[PDB]
Paper text:
A single ER‐localised Fic protein, FICD (HYPE), catalyses both AMPylation and deAMPylation of BiP. FICD is a class II Fic protein (with its αinh N‐terminal to its Fic domain) and an ER‐localised type II, single‐pass transmembrane protein, with a short cytoplasmic portion and a large luminal‐facing catalytic domain (Worby et al, 2009; Bunney et al, 2014). We report on the transition of FICD from a dimeric enzyme, that deAMPylates BiP, to a monomer with potent AMPylation activity. Mechanistically, monomerisation relieves a repressive effect allosterically propagated from the dimer interface to the inhibitory Glu234, thereby permitting AMPylation‐competent binding of MgATP.
The crystal structure of dimeric FICD suggests the existence of a hydrogen‐bond network, involving the side chains of Lys256 and Glu242, linking the dimer interface with the enzyme's active site, impinging on the AMPylation‐inhibiting Glu234. To test this notion, we mutated both putative dimer relay residues. d values under 400 nM (and EV1D and E). In vitro, both mutants established a pool of modified BiP. De‐repression of AMPylation by these dimer relay mutations was also evidenced by enhanced BiP‐dependent AMP production, relative to wild‐type FICD, whilst possessing similar deAMPylation activities. Combining the Lys256Ser and the monomerising Leu258Asp mutations (FICDK256S‐L258D) further enhanced the BiP‐AMP pool produced in vitro, an observation only partially attributable to the concomitant decrease in deAMPylation rate. These observations suggest that residues connecting the dimer interface and the active site contribute to repression of AMPylation and that mutating these residues uncouples a gain‐of‐AMPylation activity from the oligomeric state of FICD. Mutation of the dimer relay residue Lys256 does not result in large conformational changes in FICD. Moreover, with the exception of direct hydrogen bonds to mutated Lys256 side chains, in all FICD crystals the putative dimer relay hydrogen‐bond network was maintained. Note that FICDK256A is more stable than FICDK256S but less than wild‐type FICD.
Author numbering:
A (entry chain A), B (entry chain A): 104 to 434
Amino acid sequence: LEARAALNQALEMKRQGKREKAQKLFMHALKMDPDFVDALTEFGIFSEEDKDIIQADYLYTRALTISPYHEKALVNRDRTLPLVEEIDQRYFSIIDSKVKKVMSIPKGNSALRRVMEETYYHHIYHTVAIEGNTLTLSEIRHILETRYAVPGSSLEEQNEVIGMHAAMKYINTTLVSRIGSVTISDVLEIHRRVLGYVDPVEAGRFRTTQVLVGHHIPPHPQDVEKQMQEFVQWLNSEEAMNLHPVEFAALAHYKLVYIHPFIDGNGRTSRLLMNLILMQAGYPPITIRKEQRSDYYHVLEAANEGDVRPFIRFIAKCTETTLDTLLFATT
Amino acid sequence: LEARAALNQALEMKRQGKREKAQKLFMHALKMDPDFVDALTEFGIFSEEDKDIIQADYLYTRALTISPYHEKALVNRDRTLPLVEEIDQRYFSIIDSKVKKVMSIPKGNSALRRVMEETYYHHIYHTVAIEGNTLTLSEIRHILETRYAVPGSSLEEQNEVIGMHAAMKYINTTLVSRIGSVTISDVLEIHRRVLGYVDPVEAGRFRTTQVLVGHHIPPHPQDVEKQMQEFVQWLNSEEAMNLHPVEFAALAHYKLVYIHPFIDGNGRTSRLLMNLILMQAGYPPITIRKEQRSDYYHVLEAANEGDVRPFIRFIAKCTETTLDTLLFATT
Ligand SMILES: [Mg+2]
Ligand SMILES: [Mg+2]
């Protein structure tokens, strides 16, 4: 048991007062056994000493999903759960007050006008770049302003960009202002534009083949439609409307990605649905940056393994970064 | 009546023995009055002297569609109608025997192999060039071989080309060899690929707005579906199967263009349907050349004004040119 060995080194290393070695030893131990209950528990206690309550609670919560009767994780989780709820609520309150300031700024303001036009091309850049698109911000600007092809670049990559433009224009023209319930048709019409210029056969229609997505196996094609019916019901439900808008938008994003209803364009379509929910709640649209790709996939994995909270927190931080930029620009 | 004046000059000019002036004077007169019964009749008699029986009969036939009791057109038409039927049949027999020779040539032949690969890119070039696409044969070859964009050319123009490639590949993979009836779905699946990369919203769905096409007003959108049902019924009918394949393929082309079922891609889709019918009858695919555009539109106009025979003859000549090239190349 190299797992059981690595932990005892980590605990010894902590006792001595070497945080950095202990840190790595805890990580090494959980790489060797990701379901190692005592390693999660002891790394949690360690994290609380650095004042990282959220991480400690994530670890205790994970431990219990494996061994729900582990006494040391249970006693600790019972303390941290209500505490982390309060910390998470307090962060939503900081976001709420930062949105109030941004909502207040006069609509004509020359600074706010400049920022919003840049973030349009910026959103297209990052949302395609995240899927492996190699086009630059300026190349994307050239494609959308002139409608002419960029030299020595794949037509497919350029068609992903005009697809994103057509989808966002459709959302802003037809959906953002529309009052009433979201429909499966709304999602199909978004996808039709996202993927239409790349794969017109598959655009606007459900995946017909089972796939692997990282370590995720999504619903079988035969179940995709019913899962999407249950999803849009949730989008229109009472409990969804009573969530904080950032949590509602984050969970809508995660649920759609989990279902993976299309052969491709699931990520791009989910990030558009997120921004529709946020904008309908009077939030600004947010952009998960190309550089955040690895963090993005890590919090999706944590959600798949049973805890969606790090994903929600990740979307909350993206939402705060977006607001900070707008406030800064108009201050 | 400048019409009545121009004719009398033409007749006088013919009496004297000046064919060229008379020719132009007859044309000038029919420009001024396209329904001028005596001008059509007298130009017909003139055409018979040059041994142009087909033109003379076209003119007599046109005269009678205006004035069905004009005695001089009627006596002439009654003579030329059965004669032109025989001449048209004899041309179909020359085409039939030229197809027999081409069908015979060994399938492995290195010369036949070379020709057919060139005509693929050649077909895409002419079918898009006819619709106003400014891309060159080599630019089209670069787009389809590399999938990379050509410098300083519109994405739309390049997407028309990958659409044509996807449609032709689909036809050859799924339709050409398939046995049984053609369906409306087959036509929608062709259109889905033809227009999918340019207009994914409209690809594979019937026109929802009334349009003008030259001087042609097609069926109103509310009638498009029923007209397409009647059209595919005709495609699968007994009378269609008993037509000469060239006449069947030409009339299928004309009927679909007349209905104009889509917002765009009607021409490209009709030329594909023509080549599917020809190839299923063991004919080679044909290409209406960019340079023939004006002749093409002239015979479509003659069909709209009540005589489809010049259109059928035009497709027959295109079919003979195609065969002559193949025979030449392998001789
Ligand atoms: Mg590049
Ligand atoms: Mg050019």
